[PDB]
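User: Could you write out the 3D structure of this protein bound to magnesium ion? I've included everything you need below.
Assistant: Certainly. Input first, then the structure.
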Amino acid sequence: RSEDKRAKVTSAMQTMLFTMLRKLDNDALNNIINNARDGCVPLNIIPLTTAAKLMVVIPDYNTYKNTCDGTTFTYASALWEIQQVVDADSKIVQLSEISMDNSPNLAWPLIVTALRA
Amino acid sequence: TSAMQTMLFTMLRKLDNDALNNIINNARDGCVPLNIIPLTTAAKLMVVIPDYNTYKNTCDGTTFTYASALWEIQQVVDADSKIVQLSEISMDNSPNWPLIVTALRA
Amino acid sequence: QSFLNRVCGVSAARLTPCGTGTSTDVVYRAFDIYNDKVAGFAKFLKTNCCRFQEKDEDDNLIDSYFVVKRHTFSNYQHEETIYNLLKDCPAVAKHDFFKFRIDMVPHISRQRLTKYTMADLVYALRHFDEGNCDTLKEILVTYNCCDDDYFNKKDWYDFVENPDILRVYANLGERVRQALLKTVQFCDAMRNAGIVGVLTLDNQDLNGNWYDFGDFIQTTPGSGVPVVDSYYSLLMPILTLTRALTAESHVDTDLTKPYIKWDLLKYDFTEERLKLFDRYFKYWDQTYHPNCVNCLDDRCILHCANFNVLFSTVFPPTSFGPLVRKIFVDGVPFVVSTGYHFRELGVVHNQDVNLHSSRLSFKELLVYAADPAMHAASGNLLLDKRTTCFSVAALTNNVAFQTVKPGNFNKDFYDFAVSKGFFKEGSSVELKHFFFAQDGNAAISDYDYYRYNLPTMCDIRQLLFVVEVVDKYFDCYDGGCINANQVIVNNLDKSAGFPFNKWGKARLYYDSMSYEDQDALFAYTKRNVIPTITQMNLKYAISAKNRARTVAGVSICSTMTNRQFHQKLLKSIAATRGATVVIGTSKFYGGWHNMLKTVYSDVENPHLMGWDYPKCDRAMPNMLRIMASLVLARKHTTCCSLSHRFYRLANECAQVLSEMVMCGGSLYVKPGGTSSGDATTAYANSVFNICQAVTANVNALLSTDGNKIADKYVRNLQHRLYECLYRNRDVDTDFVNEFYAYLRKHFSMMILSDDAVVCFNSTYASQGLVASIKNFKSVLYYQNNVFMSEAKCWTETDLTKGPHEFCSQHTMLVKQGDDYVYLPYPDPSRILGAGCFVDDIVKTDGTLMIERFVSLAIDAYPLTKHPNQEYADVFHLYLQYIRKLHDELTTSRYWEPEFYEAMYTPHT
Amino acid sequence: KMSDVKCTSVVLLSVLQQLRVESSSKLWAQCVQLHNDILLAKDTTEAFEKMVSLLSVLLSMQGAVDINK
RNA sequence: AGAUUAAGUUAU
RNA sequence: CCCUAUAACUUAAUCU
Ligand SMILES: [Mg+2]
Ligand SMILES: [Mg+2]
Ligand SMILES: [Mg+2]
Ligand SMILES: [Mg+2]
Ligand SMILES: [Zn+2]
Ligand SMILES: [Zn+2]
C-alpha cells in the first residue's frame, strides 16, 4: 500500500509540525524577528535569545565551578536559576551534593537544567 | 543468560589461574567483595566475611590473603556498624553476623 | 674594518661582521624566481651580499642586519633612481648607496633588515620536514613564539598529537598582518610614483620592509602597476595557519582592545568582507564577489570562496547557518529557513519562498520536516562543555548516552580451532580483531574529533591549475541529471535520517512520493537551499583498535535529490575498468591482477608507493570538498544552468559539509569534513586523493633547482608550470594535457577513496621531478593540517612483490595454472576474528548460516599459497569446519578447494 | 593462554552487559575499560590482573549464584 | 544465460 | 530510541 501509508506519514508529519509551535511561545520570537531589517535572522540565535530553558552538560567538577557555581549563573547574556541537576544515570543530584571531595562519588557528566530569569 | 553464565564458568575453570580460583571459591563460601578489587595499593578493599572459619581461612593476624595477594587489614566493621578492633574478634567473640574488612595492598 | 665604518653610516649602529673581512657572505635561502632560464619557488644559494649583524649596548646580538649588495654599476644607478622615487614610503627599507676601493666597486647597503625574508617563512611552512626544520625553529624562537626548549618535546610539530602548535604559529600572526599592510603601502607608493615591477616574497623582511629595486621599471606617475599574484598566492596558506586576521576581530584593530560586539541579528557582512578585501588585498586584480551566487563559473566560485574562508574567521559563529523567517501557513505561525550564510559561499537567499499558503502538500511537508529551523526553534538552549564544537539546541530534556556492547563469542569454532592447533604461544597467527565495547561518553568523544578541522586558505593559483589536471582524470566518464524513474536505490530498508526515521525506513518515502513529486523536489533544490540534519550513530563492528567509530546517516530529503544529481556519473565511474579510480572493480576473477598490471603500466624505473591520510574524514578542508563537488558537477554542463549548478553546490554544502548534526538528542554544528553517509562520499574522497597527489607533484617540480635539471624537456616543463600557475589566468589546455601526460607516464595511480598505490619513476623522484613521500608530508602539512608520519607510509622497490597494503589486502605473486598472477590475501587474524567473534547471538549457531563461513573461506583462500604454514592452515580450518557444520546439519563442494580456486581465476 | 583470557573477558563483559551493569554509568565505564585493556594486552600477567578485577564486578553483586554453576 | 526477492560476507 | 552511503561477492527462493 502506497496511499494508506502515505496518508499515515502525512498525518504524522502534520502532527509533529503542529506540536512544535505549541512548544514555543511567540512572545519573544516576534520581537526577535521584527527587530531584524528584512525579517530574517540566523537560526543559531533563536534558542540563544528566545528559549526559556537551558541544559548544561558538565564533564567534571572543575568545569562545574567555573560555569554553574551557585544557584544562579550568567550565560548567553542572561541570568539562569538552576531548576535541577541530574547525573549520567538520570538520578536527581542535590546542589549540596556536588562538592570537591564528593565528586568521584557522582556519575559524571552532570546535566544542569536552568530557567531564564 | 544461563547458557552464557555456564560457558563463562566453563572457560573460567579451564584458565586455572590461582587468583581467579581463589576469588571463585571464596564467593561460594560467602566471602564476596563489596566493590571492585583494585590493582593499586592506594584503593581500599571491602570484603565481607560470613563466619570465623572463613575468617581464619582467609586471614591470619593482621595480613590478609585474597586474590592471590597480600593485604594488611586496616579497618573492620561488624553488621551493626560498630567499629570492631582486630584483637576484639575470636571464635568466642564471634557470637558477640557477617562483617566487612577494609584492607590495602601489600 | 674601514669598509665596516662606511657600512655603519650615520645610523650609529654597532656592527660585527657576519661574514669575514671585506668578502661576500654565502647564505642558503628560499627564492621565488622567474627568468627565461629558471623558474620556481626553491632554495638556492646567495653569494651576493655582505652581512653585518648589529650589537646592542650590552653586545647581545639583535635581529638587525646590514645587508650590503655588490653588483654591477648600471643596476646601482637604476636602484638609486627607483629608491629616490620611493624613499618617503615607510614600507621601504632604508638604503645607503656608496662606492668603495676593493680593487672602485659600488655597494648598496640595506639597513636594519631581519635575518630571514618572508619567503623563508613561507618555504619553512610549505615545505615542512621534521628533522630538517632549522629556519622554522629559528623564526619561532627569534620572534618569541615559543622558547628554544619547546622543541625538545617530541612531536612538537604534530597538529593532532600536539594541538598547542596552533597557539605557537598564531604568535606569528600580527607579524604577517603588518607585512600585508606594508605591502599595500608599497603598492600604493609604486602606483603613485609610476613604477612597474613584480613583488616577490624574497624581497621583503619579516619586519615588512621592501627592497631589491633592480627589476623595477619607471613609467609616468599615477600609472604604476605592481604585479602581486605570486606574492599573495604563495602567502595564502600562512594567512590561516598563523591566523593573521585575528586582530580584525578586536576594537579599532588592536589586540590589546576587547572584542567587537556584533549584533546577534546581523548575518550579512558583505560590506565588512569588501572592506577586508580592500584593506589587505587591494592590488589583487581579479574581481572578488563576497556572495558566490554572483560568480561567473566554477573557477570564480573557487577563487572567491578562498577569500571568504579567510574573512569568515573574523565574524561571529552565530551568524552562519540557516537564515530563518516567520511564515504563516494556514493562518498559523511557522518558522522556516529562507537562506543560508555559508562561511565559504557567503549569503544565499531562497528564490521560491511562500510567505502565505493555505495548505501543505507532501513535498513541502518533507522540506519543512527536514528543516532544522523547527527543531532548533522548539528546543531548549544547550551548553555542552564536553566538546569544543558549537552547540545549537537540545531537542529533548535528556541527554542520550548510547553505549556499544561487546561481541558475542562463538565458542564452538574457537575450540574447533584449538583442536586443530591454532592459538599457541609464539605462533604467527593470533587474535587482534575484536568487538571493543564503549561507554556512554563515546559518541560525543568521537564527535569531538571535528576539532582537527581548521579553516584553511589555499594557494588559489596552484589550486586552479590542479583542478584542471584533476578534471583531466575524470574525462572518460558520463554524467548529468536523470529523472526519478531512472534512479536505482539498492537497499530500500535502510534508515531515512532524522526526523524521518520516526515513521519509516527509506522504503516508505520512496513509495509514498510519486516520481513527479521526486522530480519536483529535485527541481526545488536547483533554486532553493534545504538544510538538513545528519544523525550520528555508533558502529557495532570488529576492529583492531579501541577507537569508537561513528556513522553519519543523512536524511532522505538530501539523499533522494543527490542520487538524482550524481547517480549517472557515479555508475559511470563504478563501471569503468583500466582507469585510475578503481571503484567498482572486483578483486575476484583476475581483477586484482588486472588492476596491478594497469597501475604498473609503462613506468620506466618503477617503485611502488602508498601513503596515509591521518583523520581523513575529520581533517579535510572545506575548499577541497567544494573543489571535489565542483569536479563532479562539471558533467552537468548541458542539463543544468549556472544558477542551478550553484544551488546544487550550496545544497551539498548545507547538507553534508556544514550541516547540523544530531548526536544524542542534541543539535551541534559540524565544522566541516565528510559525512560518512553522503551519496557521493567515496567518489569525492577519490577526487580529493588525486588532488593531493597532483599538488604534491606540482610542489615537487616547482621546488627543484632548475639549473640542476639535466633533461631539457623537464626543465621547460617546470618553466611553463610556473607560468601556468602564477603568470597566466586563463586555462592553458595544451599545458594541462602535457602535464597530465607527464603524470600518467611517470606517476601512475590506483585510487580507491583515501587508499592509493602509485608506481613512480625512481630516477625522476630521486632528482625531485615527481613527488615522493616527503612531498606528500609537506602538502598534507600546509593543506590538510595534519602530520603524516612515514611510519604509516610504505615504499616498495621490488615489483614482483605487490603493493604492501591496498584496501586491507596484501599481494602475492603466485603460479596459477601456467601463469603467474597477483592474488590478494587478508590478514589471517581478521578472518579468524570474524570466525570467532560475532555481533548477533544467532550467528553463534553455526548450523544456521554456513554461508558466513563460506564467504570467509572465499576471502581466506589465497592464504593457501603462502610460505607461512600457519597462514595456510586458516583456509583448511575453515574448510574442515564448513564440512563439520554441513554434515551435522543433516553441496560437498564447500570443503572441496576447487569452488574457492574458481573465484581467483580469470574465467568469470 | 592469552587467547583464552581474551575470549573469556569477551564472555564476561557480555554477561555483565545482560545483567544490567549498563544501568550504572560509573560501573560500565570501568567494565569497558578493563575489557578493552584485556583485549589489547601483550603479556598475560597484566591480562590476568585486569581479568581478576573484572570478575570481581560479577561476583560483587548477588545476581549470580556460584553454587549452582 | 538474464532479471527479481531475501539472507550473509568483504572493502572504503 | 537507534544502526549511513558506495562497491564487490556468495547462497537460497522466484520469473523468463
Ligand atoms: Mg631579491
Ligand atoms: Mg633584484
Ligand atoms: Mg586512515
Ligand atoms: Mg585507508
Ligand atoms: Zn567570484
Ligand atoms: Zn544536471
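The longest strand of chain C covers residues 332-342.
User: Perfect, thank you.
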